[PDB]
Amino acid sequence: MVKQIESKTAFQEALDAAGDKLVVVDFSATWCGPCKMIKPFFHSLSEKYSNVIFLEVDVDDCADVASESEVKSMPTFQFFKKGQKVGEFSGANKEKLEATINELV
Numbered sequence: 001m002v003k004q005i006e007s008k009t010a011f012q013e014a015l016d017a018a019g020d021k022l023v024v025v026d027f028s029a030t031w032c033g034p035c036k037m038i039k040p041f042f043h044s045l046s047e048k049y050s051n052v053i054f055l056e057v058d059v060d061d062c063a064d065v066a067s068e069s070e071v072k073s074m075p076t077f078q079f080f081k082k083g084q085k086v087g088e089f090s091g092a093n094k095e096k097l098e099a100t101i102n103e104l105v
C-alpha cells in the first residue's frame with residue numbers, strides 16, 4: 001500500500017514512525033503523464049518490499065510539502081532513513097527506482 005500524505009505534519013509523523021526502515025516518497029502531479037504511468041509500479045513495489053515504507057505526495061494538493069521538499073519535476077522520488085534524506089532522483093525510471101531501493105534499504 002501507498003500512504004497518501006496530506007500535510008506537513010503527516011509527513012513528519014511518517015518519517016518518525018518509520019524507525020530504521022527505508023522510506024520512499026513519490027512526489028507526483030495529476031497532470032504529469034509519467035507519474036501516472038509509474039503509479040501501478042510504485043504500488044507494486046510497496047507490496048514486494050514489505051519492510052520499506054512507501055508514501056505519495058500530490059504536489060498540488062499538498063503544496064506546502066512540495067515547496068519544502070524543493071520538487072520541480074514529477075515524478076521525484078526521495079528516500080529517507082532515520083528522518084534524513086539519503087537519496088533523490090527524478091523521472092519515471094523503474095529500473096533506477098528499484099535499484100535505488102536495493103542500494104539504500
